Amino acid sequence: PVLTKSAGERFLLYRPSTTTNSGLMAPDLYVYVDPAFTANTRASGTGVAVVGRYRDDYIIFALEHFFLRALTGSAPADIARCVVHSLTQVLALHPGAFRGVRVAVEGNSSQDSAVAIATHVHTEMHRGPELLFYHCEPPGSAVLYPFFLLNKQKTPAFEHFIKKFNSGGVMASQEIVSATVRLQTDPVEYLLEQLNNLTSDDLMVAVIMAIYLAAQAGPPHTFAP
Numbered sequence: 001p002v003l004t005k006s007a008g009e010r011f012l013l014y015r016p017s018t019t020t021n022s023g024l025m026a027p028d029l030y031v032y033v034d035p036a037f038t039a040n041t042r043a044s045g046t047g048v049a050v051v052g053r054y055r056d057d058y059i060i061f062a063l064e065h066f067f068l069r070a071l072t073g074s075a076p077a078d079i080a081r082c083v084v085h086s087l088t089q090v091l092a093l094h095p096g097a098f099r100g101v102r103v104a105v106e107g108n109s110s111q112d113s114a115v116a117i118a119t120h121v122h123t124e125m126h127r128g129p130e131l132l133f134y135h136c137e138p139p140g141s142a143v144l145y146p147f148f149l150l151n152k153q154k155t156p157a158f159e160h161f162i163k164k165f166n167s168g169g170v171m172a173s174q175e176i177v178s179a180t181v182r183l184q185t186d187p188v189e190y191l192l193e194q195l196n197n198l199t200s201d202d203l204m205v206a207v208i209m210a211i212y213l214a215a216q217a218g219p220p221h222t223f224a225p
Contacts, residue, residue, distance in 0.1 A: 002198035007166045012188055015174040016054060018061065022097045023224030026053030026217075029061070029090065029101040029129075032148075032210035033083055034202045037113050039070040047202030048083050049210040050090055052098075057169040058211045061093075062086040062177035063187045065203050076113055080120030082180070089177045091129065097222040104134040104213060106205075107147030111138070114147035122146075134213070150209065157212035162198070170211065 018025060034047040048064035066082045068075050087101065103121060107114035118133050125131050133146035164170050178187040194204040 002162055003195055004166050007168060008192055010168060011171060012192060015172050016059060017174040018059060019093050019175050022094055022222050024055050025097055025222040027099040027220060027222045028052060029098050030210050030214040031103045032206045034106045034206040035079055035109055035117060036202060037075055037109060039068040043200050045200055045202050046079050047206035048086060049206040050086060051210040051214055053214055058214055060172045060176060061090045063191055063203060064178060064180045066180045076116035077120045080117050080124060083121055084124045085179060086177055093175055098129045100130050100132060102132045104148040106150055108150050111147055115145055118146035157208055160215060161208045161211055
């Protein structure tokens, strides 16, 4: 019961309308993708979060809990198409708001598969805001790969999130985007069910890590239109 019920209820209910308060947003989007490369399993979901700064708080613009079709020949591109579709919708809902989107693809599962996802995201997004990837120089290597390795930074990320969430500093956009969590359950309600397991975690990890990335930060605001 790490996150208090009271903060959880407020997270569900009070959702700033981002499309009409764009002046309160920071001009950078942060996205984290926590991939699972299997199908026909309950822990085979890929988590995606796109978040940003709202005043000095953090707001979620989109969520995905994506399940590979079994025996596709293009799992990384299927995941990439999912994240690109999410981003696009977020971009279209807030036109001209963002100067940068920064994308982290967790590579713990497979570095090559994470790189492939980044490459497809890179290419598809090529059809304004600049797109950057988090890069990682694996131990013993001089190469900078466009994936993120989750290790020592997990405990600080979780610790900061819990403190921010409990004090009312993390919220969801009233016009939060989700293609994968729309028909069966409310995306914010679904995320909160995963979050209340703190003591399948792809969505929770993506959200907490996307926010941790945004939390290393700067000082301008999106324009007011």
